[PDB]
Structure formats: C-alpha cells, structure tokens
Amino acid sequence: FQSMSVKGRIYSILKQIGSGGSSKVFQVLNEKKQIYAIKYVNLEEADNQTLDSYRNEIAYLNKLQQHSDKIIRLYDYEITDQYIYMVMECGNIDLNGWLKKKKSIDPWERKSYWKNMLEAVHTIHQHGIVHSDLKPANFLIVDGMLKLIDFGIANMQPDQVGTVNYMPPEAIKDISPKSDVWSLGCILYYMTYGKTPFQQIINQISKLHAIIDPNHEIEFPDIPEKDLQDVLKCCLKRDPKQRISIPELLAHPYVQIQ
C-alpha cells in the first residue's frame, strides 16, 4: 500500500501482479482514481548490454503504440541510472492465467484471440522484431481483446519461466519471423486440444528430442472446426520454410470466414 511517483504524478500501490528478477509489476491507482499497471525495474546490478536491451524494448513499445491497438498501452515512464517505472494499462488477466482458470474455451473466443495474436505479432515483424519466445503469459486480456505485453528484447512469473513447450524446432538446433508462427501455433493447439503438442512428454530431454524429431508424428485430432485443424497443421510444420507465414495466416479461411 506504499505510494510512488512517475513524472510528478502520484500512484498508490494496490497489489503485486508479478515479479521478474530485478523487476516487479504492481496494480496501482492514481490521483484521478484510475487503475493502471506499473512495471518497476531495478537497474542497480545491471550491465550496459542489459541496460541497452531495456532501453530498446521501451523505445519499441513507445513507437508501436501508434501502429497497433494489439500492443499494451504505455501511458508514461520515469528512467534514471537507478530504476525504470512504466505506466501501462492494467487489463483483466494474462492469457496464461485465463487458460489455467477455465477448463474449456469457447470456439468464437478462440478466433477472436487468434486474430488478435496474429495482428500483435505481425506488427512487431513489420518493424524487424521477432519475439522468439511466445507463451500465453506474453498476452494480456483487455476487455475481450488480446494485447502483446512484450517483444522478448529485454533479458515473466505471476507473483512461464524458461518454457520449452512453445519452442520452435530451429531454436533447439540453435530465429526468423517463422519462429513466432511455431509458438503461436502451440498456443492455439493448447486453446484447441487443452495441452501443448508436446505437453504429455514428462522429461525435458525427451521433449526436446521430440520437437526436433520429424518421425515423431504430432497428433491433430478431428474437431468440428476443419479450418482450425489446417491452421494447426500449417503452423506446426518443423521446416520453417514449409511453415505458414503471418500474412498468409491472416487470409486463412479460419480468421476470415463467418
């Protein structure tokens, strides 16, 4: 319940949304009694490369404000040699929290979320950015609308730390815009089938080996949504060159037909 100031404006802390090493996201309230999210970054122990990775993500979030409504709103920020405070839109819940909370998701809710994820990821691709690490936790639900929280440029946990379930097969070998297609593909597979394509594999060394194994058939069960099975099968292709692009996903019958 301790107060804080961002560019001369007062924000009293209400709760703590998440934590990241050297970082903390809090639910706050300003003097006009509106509700915001404030990301606090502790810069004290951080190198010049880390610092520049943080300054790079801020600038992109600041720029990509204008280009898409599928990117988290950044209202203001205070930057010192000591800390970063970023005043963002609060939203309802992250996509991981929502998917973990409810058992089954509505087929319509799924298309809307998909359209939103493609639009978000497309905007960063349009600027030279590949997130390279997409998980439902990177997306925020803001009044039925999914928004991309970050660009995986800056070096979190709600209080998926280093997940492999949404990892592309080229990342296990090692990154191109096609990597984000694999990751988005896994999120959809989770929204369609209730688990990631390789979720069932208890071991991480056995899971890592499965993603890169082409003779390890990924199942694609029969569902009423025929177009959806095709989106899934098109995204989860091991060769990046044989995997569908975002411009092509945005003109797929799934996202476009009533």
Ligand SMILES: Cn1cc(-c2ccc(Nc3ccc(C#N)c(NC4CCCCC4)n3)cc2OCC#N)cn1
């Ligand atoms: C029941 N429940 C609600 C949440 C939640 C989760 C996230 C947010 N909003 C934001 C707004 C900005 C950021 C940033 N940066 C962020 N990050 C979190 C960090 C922890 C992992 C999920 C994303 N979350 C708001 C959230 O609730 C509304 C508020 N305050 C999680 N569980």
